[PDB]
Ligand binder design. Structure first.
Ligand SMILES: Cc1cc(C#N)cc(C)c1Oc1nc(Nc2ccc(C#N)cc2)nc(N)c1Br
Ligand SMILES: [Cl-]
Lengths: 401, 552
């Protein structure tokens, strides 16, 4: 039985260009795709299917996994997986001591896909140097990566989990795309034991890492504490406070740019004053805490900005409206884009757990550069949306750790 | 002549229905030609006669052939095409020679009547109904519908290639060592077999094709190396661009120069160090295609330099999958990069150039990286792997820049090669403020409707100066104030600004810019021995800033 799937009215299916792939990945892809089609999960298609979505290969661990970018299709089915049914997000997942993530994407290969929808899942395996025509398939079953699959499999998932939920009321289990998020406050050993227990239920219906979200704390905008202070140091200080002021209600710089009078040499050392030293402390109190006045709005996109801090350090902020930081963080520790990619995956993962959606990223890197390389390090089964931007040199500085 | 291949299901866009276009009257010689053409086509199965049952119709007409005395049936599918579903695009692109493997013998087979040899979907045929008009439209016409892919219909190119690819598949799967490329009507076939055993492999293909409806002319008329293909000249184990003739002219039109550029750009695929900068600067501006553009001196010498390079033939080499690709890049006229890609030095598989400004302000290290990135994507498309690079930059130069810059970046495995001019950083800004260097607090600021600007500075050594700039922007004034401070200070100097914009520019360490001012500011930065640039919030009462802020 196939739950009929309708696109958003007035939109057509995706027609996205296949990126060029390396010989090594193409070959992995044919292997994978010939096996998938014997099994009848995908079928070869004719020219009368005009649609396309991008496909590539990653390492899940020496073994190729296939990854379809349904970012565009997802946008065009949206209404469906977001507001017809559509999986509700547990508010306490982010409060657990331990949450484990498990891949249950294999489950969707079981369920048939609505025939009048299959044609929208078309993808192409390109050939090197354009020497032969791409080989072309659509899906016959719920595809991994399409946000429709968990929405449709939803009904079967709560059935699979009911006894286990019934037996552990205080364990939280949230599905997102191809992953199951399972959280508890058990001690880590007892948590791992419940996970294996859960794996056994899953195992009877078809099926084959650890977060501690309650230890996620914000990265404050930090104010240096100095032995001695220069004009230059105080100006930097007045800058940073002035930015934090456009966000954090309460920030006061009055007593501080007091010290900065006239026309002093940048290297002149200027005395600390009480009411200044007090303004600096009182400002620290504020930067420590959540932003008074900022809330998640379930109907707006999440944005995530990242800044390259150098030396393997990256800073980030998540907001819906600019400067109203919902969260702020860092990521630490070779390869600039490898790191960026890890950082995006870390940030995406936290975002899924807290709000139950992926942010659109503002990436400090050359489009072409990122487009070339990111698949070299990607390990998630989802892909967030992203743009590319040039970090305003000051923003980098103000979020410096 | 009509393939037994299964048809592709077709249908019209979701809302729409088949065309119902009125046939206009034709002259009588034209009606005569149509009747005999269509009578030939009908006896061959291509079309067949229908009754007035069929609601749909599409205009036909006929034209005289090639100054000769034949006619060709033309059908106007405008409306059918507008009502027909979209298809998968045929080719994502065409192979590059540099990516081709070498073959002893090659043969081109041409599929006769390609489209009329592929059946058209039974359910869709009705929508192709056309009518041959009777004389003066007095009596009802002769009505036909297509049974095969019509010339000029929207789906024919896509359905033919797919058809040919299903049919080709077995032969391919059974002859992995022999290679076939399909493009439209033609089949290009390559083997490392010897002329005898290859021609035998051809016949098996031909007879396989014929088993499937597709006829091909024979072994008596099949051409020889070299082969002309997509603007290239292909030989068994080398390749080159088709012969490129640069005219001798005393007067060049806008049009002549455009053609001249295109041919040079084309030649640059395999001819090393072709430059078009000076010829391209001629195109800048608005001029008719017929108008004459006096070449400049630089442009006249470029054309000269190019004409030498093209003198001696050069060829490219084909790809050996078992060896790495090396890519080498050189600097040329500012913003121009050339590159070669080889597997054995220095037998190039191909060459090329890169010349693009990203942003208004770049430096050589940014440009080189963009070129590495562009060349890497090209290699993946052509060869399916990335090249080992050789680059005119010290590992230390690149390493200083990567960290200095706030943008993320990465280039594959590469090594230094000493091929001047070397790319480098021409200055570096101080990380920390400088002791014993004058601190200039600068500030520029315009009037939004007047466009009158005042730039200037105050100093901790009590020096100060303001100037009046005319018809400039608030942008340009903040930059002029930086320039001012660079001119009037010594070899060391700390500059304090309020312009995040100006900060952005300089902090990125440009060495090129569209801007005259910025190139001025750069010249100064080079000559200095220490510059520290710092930013402060505008009108937030910051000591030094307010002073030079009121005073403007
Ligand atoms: C067989 C062939 C002929 C012509 C044409 N014309 C053009 C193309 C694109 C061809 O296909 C291929 N040719 C070659 N090498 C090759 C070698 C020598 C010559 C010669 N002479 C031509 C092509 N390698 C491939 N992988 C493919 Br697919
Ligand atoms: Cl909230």
């Amino acid at each position: 039985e196939t739950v009929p799937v309708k696109l958003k009215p007035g939109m057509d299916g995706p027609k996205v260009k296949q990126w060029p792939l390396t010989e090594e990945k193409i070959k992995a892809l044919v292997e994978i795709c010939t096996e998938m089609e014997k099994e009848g999960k995908i079928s070869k298609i004719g020219p009368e299917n005009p649609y396309n979505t991008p496909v590539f290969a990653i390492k899940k661990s020496t073994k190729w996994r296939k990854l379809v970018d349904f970012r565009e299709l997802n946008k065009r089915t949206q209404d469906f997986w977001e507001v017809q049914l559509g999986i509700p997000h547990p508010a306490g997942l982010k409060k657990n001591k331990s949450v484990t993530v498990l891949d249950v994407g294999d489950a969707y290969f079981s369920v048939p896909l609505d025939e009048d929808f299959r044609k929208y899942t078309a993808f192409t395996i390109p050939s090197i140097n354009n020497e032969t025509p791409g080989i072309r398939y659509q899906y016959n079953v719920l595809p991994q990566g399409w946000k429709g699959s968990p929405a449709i499999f939803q009904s079967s998932m709560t059935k699979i989990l009911e006894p286990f939920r019934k037996q552990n009321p205080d364990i939280v289990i949230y599905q997102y795309m191809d992953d199951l998020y399972v959280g508890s406050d058990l001690e880590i050993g007892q948590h791992r034991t419940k996970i294996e227990e859960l794996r056994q239920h899953l195992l009877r219906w078809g099926l084959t890492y650890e977060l501690h979200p309650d230890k996620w704390t914000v990265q404050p905008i930090v104010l240096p504490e100095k032995d001695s202070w220069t004009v230059n140091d105080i100006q930097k200080l007045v800058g940073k406070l002035n930015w934090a002021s456009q966000i954090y209600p309460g920030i006061k710089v009055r007593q501080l740019c007091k010290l900065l009078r006239g026309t002093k040499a940048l290297t002149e050392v200027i005395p600390l004053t009480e009411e200044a030293e007090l303004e600096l402390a009182e400002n620290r109190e504020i930067l420590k805490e959540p932003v008074h006045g900022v809330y998640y709005d379930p109907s707006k996109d999440l944005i995530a900005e990242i800044q390259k801090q150098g030396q393997g350090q990256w800073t980030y902020q998540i907001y819906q409206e600019p400067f109203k930081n919902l969260k702020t963080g860092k990521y630490a520790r070779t390869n600039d884009v490898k790191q960026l990619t890890e950082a995006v995956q870390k940030i995406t993962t936290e975002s899924i757990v807290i709000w139950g959606k992926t942010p659109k990223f503002k990436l400090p890197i050359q489009k072409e550069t990122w487009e070339t390389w990111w698949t070299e390090y990607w390990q998630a089964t989802w892909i967030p949306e992203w743009e590319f931007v040039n970090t305003p040199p000051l923003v980098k500085l103000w979020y410096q750790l | 002549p009509i393939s037994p291949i299964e048809t592709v299901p077709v249908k019209l866009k979701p809302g729409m229905d088949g065309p119902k276009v009125k046939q206009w009257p034709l002259t009588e010689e034209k009606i005569k030609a149509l009747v005999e053409i269509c009578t030939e086509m009908e006896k061959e199965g291509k079309i067949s006669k229908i009754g007035p049952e069929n609601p749909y119709n599409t205009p036909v007409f006929a034209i005289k052939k090639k100054d000769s005395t034949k006619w060709r049936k033309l059908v106007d599918f405008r409306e059918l095409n507008k009502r027909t579903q979209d298809f998968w695009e045929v080719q994502l692109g065409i192979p590059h020679p540099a990516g081709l493997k070498k073959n002893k013998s090659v043969t081109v087979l041409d599929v006769g009547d390609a489209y009329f040899s592929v059946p058209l979907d039974e359910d869709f045929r009705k929508y192709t109904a056309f009518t041959i008009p009777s004389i003066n439209n007095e009596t009802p016409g002769i009505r036909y519908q297509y049974n095969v892919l019509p010339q000029g219909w929207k789906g024919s190119p896509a359905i033919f290639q797919s058809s040919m690819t299903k049919i080709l598949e077995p032969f391919r799967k059974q002859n992995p060592d022999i290679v076939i490329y399909q493009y439209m009507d033609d089949l290009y076939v390559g083997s490392d077999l010897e002329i005898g055993q290859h021609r035998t492999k051809i016949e098996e293909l031909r007879q396989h094709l014929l088993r499937w409806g597709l006829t091909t002319p024979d072994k008596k008329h099949q051409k020889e190396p070299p082969f002309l293909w997509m603007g290239y000249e292909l030989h068994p184990d080398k390749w080159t661009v088709q012969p490129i003739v640069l005219p001798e002219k005393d007067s060049w039109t806008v049009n002549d120069i455009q053609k001249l550029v295109g041919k040079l750009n084309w030649a640059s695929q395999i001819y090393p160090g072709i430059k078009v900068r000076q010829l391209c600067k001629l195109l800048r501006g608005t001029k008719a295609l017929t108008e004459v553009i006096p070449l400049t001196e630089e442009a006249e010498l470029e054309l000269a330099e190019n004409r030498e390079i093209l003198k001696e033939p050069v060829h490219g080499v084909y790809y050996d999958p078992s060896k790495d690709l090396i890519a080498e890049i050189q600097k040329q006229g500012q913003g121009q990069w050339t590159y070669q890609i080889y597997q054995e030095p220095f037998k190039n598989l191909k060459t090329g150039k890169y010349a693009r400004m990203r942003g208004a302000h770049t430096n050589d290290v940014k440009q080189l990286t963009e070129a590495v990135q562009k060349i890497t994507t090209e290699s993946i498309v052509i060869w399916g792997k990335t090249p080992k690079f050789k680059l005119p930059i010290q590992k230390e130069t690149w390493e200083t820049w990567w960290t200095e810059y706030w943008q993320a970046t990465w280039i594959p495995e590469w090594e230094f090669v000493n091929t001047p001019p070397l790319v480098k950083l021409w200055y570096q800004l101080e990380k920390e403020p400088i002791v014993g260097a004058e601190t200039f607090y600068v500030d520029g600021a315009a009037n939004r409707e007047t466009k009158l600007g005042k730039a200037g500075y105050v100093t901790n050594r009590g020096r100060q100066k303001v100037v009046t700039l005319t018809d400039t922007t608030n942008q340009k004034t903040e930059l002029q104030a930086i320039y001012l401070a660079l001119q009037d200070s010594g070899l060391e100097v700390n500059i304090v600004t309020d312009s995040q914009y100006a900060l952005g520019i300089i902090q990125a360490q440009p060495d090129q810019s569209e801007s005259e001012l910025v190139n001025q500011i750069i010249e100064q930065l080079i000559k200095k021995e220490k510059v520290y640039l710092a930013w402060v919030p505008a009108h937030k009462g910051i000591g030094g800033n307010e002073q030079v802020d009121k005073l403007v």
